[PDB]
Design a protein around this nucleic acid. Structure first.
Ligand SMILES: [Zn+2]
Ligand SMILES: [Zn+2]
Length: 104
DNA sequence: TTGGGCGCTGCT
DNA sequence: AGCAGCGCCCAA
């Protein structure tokens, strides 16, 4: 539980990003996945109610709040997102590849 | 207006 | 462990 709550700065190595995500194991990987998806041109997150699509689950959460105000957004975990493919594996590697021992 | 992401955590 | 969500400060 201690090692659960330790801050690990995860550095994004995408060209001229170099942002540091102040991550914790407790948070899970969603904010890291979303950050990598933001560096990719594809809009692989699809709304469950309308035609909208976007890059990140954070974008989709904003979409639901504004367009689907009375509806819960559901099914947008890393296990629901199409991640097991080469395009995403490549972008994840570019951003965080040297830090996968810490991420898992 | 959009929304990154900090910090949160109910739940499995 | 860590998923899969959320409130909200502030310019990512
Ligand atoms: Zn980055
Ligand atoms: Zn929609």
């Amino acid at each position: 539980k201690e090692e659960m709550n330790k801050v690990h700065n995860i550095k994004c190595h995408f060209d001229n990003c170099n942002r540091k995500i102040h991550w914790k194991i407790r948070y899970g990987k969603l904010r890291l996945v979303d950050h990598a998806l933001s560096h990719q041109e594809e809009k692989s997150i699809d709304c469950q109610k309308c035609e909208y699509s976007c890059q990140t689950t954070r974008q989709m959460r904003y979409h639901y709040k504004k367009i689907h105000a009375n509806l819960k957004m559901e099914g947008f975990g890393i296990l629901n997102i199409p991640l097991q493919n080469t395009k995403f594996s490549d972008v994840w590697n570019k951003c965080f590849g040297d830090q996968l021992k810490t991420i898992g």
